[PDB]
Structures are given as structure tokens and as C-alpha cells.
Write a protein that binds this ligand. Sequence first.
Ligand SMILES: [Ca+2]
Length: 113
Amino acid sequence: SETVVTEVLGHRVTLPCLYSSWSHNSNSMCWGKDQCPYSGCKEALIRTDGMRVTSRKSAKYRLQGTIPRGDVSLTILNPSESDSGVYCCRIEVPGWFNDVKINVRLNLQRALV
Ligand SMILES: [Ca+2]
């Protein structure tokens, strides 16, 4: 189950991810490219605890919504062709075998002419 986002041709683009029951005392999440990151959320594009981003692969990735409300959509600055493809938003939920995996396919194109 994925949401498809289409953008032609570039300055910034947001990939939706919402987890409305989010609690700052329980939740954290991360984003990954091509595949969902593993439990624990290491080596990811960007990652949060219950309140805020705590690391990212580069400045190209932002989270602008309220993280304590589960607005964890990824903003990608200056996106380009290689930014296309599958992305996965992994919600970390207490317990095992219960993390939520949300997929967005980003179609980043240019005008045809
Ligand atoms: Ca879990």
C-alpha cells in the first residue's frame, strides 16, 4: 500500500506520512530510500525521537510538521531525477513486530517539450 506523488520539475517536494495517535513518550520514526529502514532506525535519511529530528543523512531532508502530533512527512529540498523512487516512513511503536510502514513512491520528472 503506497501513495504516489508526482512532481515536475523542482525546488522542494513533500512526501506525506501521518501517525495521528503519536505520543512523544512512545514514538519515534525514520525515513528510508528504496526499502524501509530496519527496527532501530539506524542508517536512514532522517530520524526523530518523540519530539524532534535527531540526525539526518544531509540537509536536503527536513521535517516541517509537528512531530509530537505525528506530522512526520519528509520534505526534500531541491529534488532531482535521482531523488525518484520508493521511500518508506517507519513509525516505531513499543513492542516487537508492530512498527507501522508507510510507503510513498516519488515520481520526479521534468517537462517534455
Ligand atoms: Ca516496535
